[model samples]
Target chain A: SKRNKPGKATGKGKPVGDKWLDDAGKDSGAPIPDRIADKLRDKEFKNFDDFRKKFWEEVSKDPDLSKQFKGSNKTNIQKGKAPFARKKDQVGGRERFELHHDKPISQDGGVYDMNNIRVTTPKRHIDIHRGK
Target chain B: LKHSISDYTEAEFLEFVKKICRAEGATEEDDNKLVREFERLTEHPDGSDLIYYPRDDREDSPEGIVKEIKEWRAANGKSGFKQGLEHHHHHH
Candidate 1:
């Protein structure tokens, strides 16, 4: 089975000072494999409307897993206006569908490791970034 | 403030342009503007998913943006905005 098995592009070495990248900070681009980029950059998304629709569609596919992101959807968890567009403080916008890294690569974590990321709202993303 | 299209890489920039062009309320005029604006600064070629470095010189400013865009185009590649052109005209 291919499950949980490291493949061709998996990290072959260790994390270094600060950058925490495999090969000891050699790859500065933090190049997450093209395969993942291809997956996320779905061909079905020919335009922004399709992109937004696909984002929600992907969320709906895993309803249980998406619940953690729904808290601020119906409630104002951020307490004020949002700092950016498309999701300006109304709950359950595309922002919530954005992927959040649990341990940012800047902090010495895997950029493409599935365990390091989760789908979440932008508000939660901002809050987390703010150290709240 | 955090993330801008300016922060995107070549592939990501193309994806972003695709998204923005399809955004709600985005008009053909906007598409033309973006197309013109972006093409002026990039190293894109026919049928390539690549666009090179974004000119970081005075990007967010108004007058500078227009000036630099014009200067960049005058100093470089394809000028004008027609993302897809049709090749037709037949009398058979």
Candidate 2:
């Protein structure tokens, strides 16, 4: 099986077109909205690396402009804070919860989409990240 | 990104701290501080985002976690585990 290694400069072998969007959609478990797809299509990237860089640049510019964009939720998550309400004693009598992106933003996942977000215990979150 | 210190064995946990300290060019005192801070952060209700758990199989290694944290800190304009270490080195 071919694995996509992060931080490798193998952009030449990766898709940089609509196919890339399609794969991202699959990873995100949601179809890329046509409007967003159109916007992405308008930005012609040289390769996957360019796409990732420019995509994040646009997100950081005005994160609140779109619900799908990386916004306060992601920032908060990165800070180990809850992006939304936490269920009382959801995990072993502790009010602790972690926000997990079903498809991580590092791989172009939707940042604020509820469908892409899962509220989970820290243990489960680590398990998921570890692919356990 | 939150993780518990208990999640890793003592060896593994120390390895992580050592790697992070090396990456940050941390002093011995700074390393001691990081050890305490990491423990506190992980044991806290919110957990510690400083500990990077790989999001997928592709980046599932201690080195990967360290690299991810380094990149995240750099991107956020935050100082490393040791503050002022960056000033000592000139990046051309």
Candidate 3:
């Protein structure tokens, strides 16, 4: 078995594409549970835009989670602290934020678990893949 | 409650302090006081507990808790225990 070594990190692998999303897709053939699939279709988020919107909504009620994002993650993605400022004027603005799997699926992460998913701007996601 | 600060991982404890300030209303002076208290206890074994359980009693007062932590550190021959933040669940 090609097992990852202790402390070997994933997600820093080649920058992902829709392959990861397809892996969790309804027709992916992976034996995902109903909860996992529902989480995927509704909560795990297929793209960055949805994740960003939902993430802040969750943080509004969870202050501890809010602090972690604000401090450790260094994003202004606080809950109810301020309204969002969308870049709707810019073309492809919403597409720019990438859905990041905090726990890489390459490491056998259950692809749709809320704990494993995060949203980050495209450049930061690229930096992550470069191990920066 | 006289509980171990170990109940909260160090990171959670710090965030709890942030909540404290917000819940009480943040003022410049109030913010400074919390920061001062934070720095004073960050290296103590009972850091979070001290913050959560400040009291007028001799052993549980601000100065008393700091002094006891120092004496306990001397007896055990150590620095602060700053571990276990990674095990818990949180946003970041």
Candidate 4:
């Protein structure tokens, strides 16, 4: 019936938290997933890499996301590159996927948190956050 | 005083938040942010596959990107996607 047009744009509404954690307290410095950690160690595009790392670090502060990871959404992990991407058909598959807000903190003009992140294809990463 | 366990991966986490935008009727907010980022990434003339090549000509490099990541961790506390429902829970 009702909809949120302005609230979504300004990001000025009740935060529903994320899907995986206890979503009750402050950050406890939990370990990032191996996929993200490994991506953190990527040597391809370092500056952008740093940008991405900071971006996700900020996302880890949400309660809901924490519980989701601890519960059903538990990541199993797939080492190497992603499929249908620019790569050697047999090599460089995406190790794992970690989500983030399409709007980066450097520019979001808000406190970086889960609210800004989202799940997307790796190709989306290259399309939205990569070169050009 | 504080919960000490996390929940989602960086990617999984952000994706979830986008829904929050929708539930709260914030789809425009969620969608627009996505559109904006896409535009920024494609701003370069080389298309949307610009890997940060490391060099010394006063520009960013792949190695430079890595350096930035390490530095951000040192200065910042944790990943943007965190776990907790401090103010929103009505569990009481």
Question: Per-prediction DockQ scores?
Answer: 0.02, 0.02, 0.01, 0.02
Top candidate when judged by TM-score against the true structure? 2
Native contacts matched by each model: 0.00, 0.00, 0.00, 0.00
Q: What tens-digit string does per-residue lDDT give for candidate 3 at A1-132? A: 122222211122223332222222122111222232232344335444444445445544444333322231222233212221112211122222344666566787644455455445444455556675
TM-score, ranked from best to worst? 2, 1, 3, 4
- After TM-score superposition, the amount by which residue A130's alpha carbon in candidate 4 deviates from its true location, in angstroms, is 14
2 or 4, greater by DockQ: 2
Chain B TM-score in each of the candidates: 0.29, 0.35, 0.33, 0.24
Q: If you assessed candidate 2 against the hidden native complex, which CAPRI class would it receive?
A: incorrect
TM-score of chain A of each: 0.34, 0.31, 0.33, 0.29
Best to worst by lDDT, what's the order? Answer: 2, 3, 1, 4
What is the C-alpha lDDT profile of model 2 across B9-68, one tens digit per residue?
A: 444554765554342322323433453456453343322223322244434344555555
- TM-score (chain B) for candidate 1 is 0.29
What local lDDT score does residue A26 receive in model 4, on the 0 to 100 scale?
Answer: 18
* Model 1 quality (TM-score): 0.25
The docking category that best describes candidate 1 is incorrect
Over A1-132, each residue of candidate 2 has an lDDT whose tens digit, in order, gives 011323222111121322221232122222323333334543444544344434334433333323331232243333323322122223332223344567776787644433454445544555567676
Scored by DockQ, the top model is 2
- Which residue window of length 10 is worst by lDDT in model 3 chain A? A82-91
User: Which is superior by TM-score, 1 or 3?
Assistant: 1
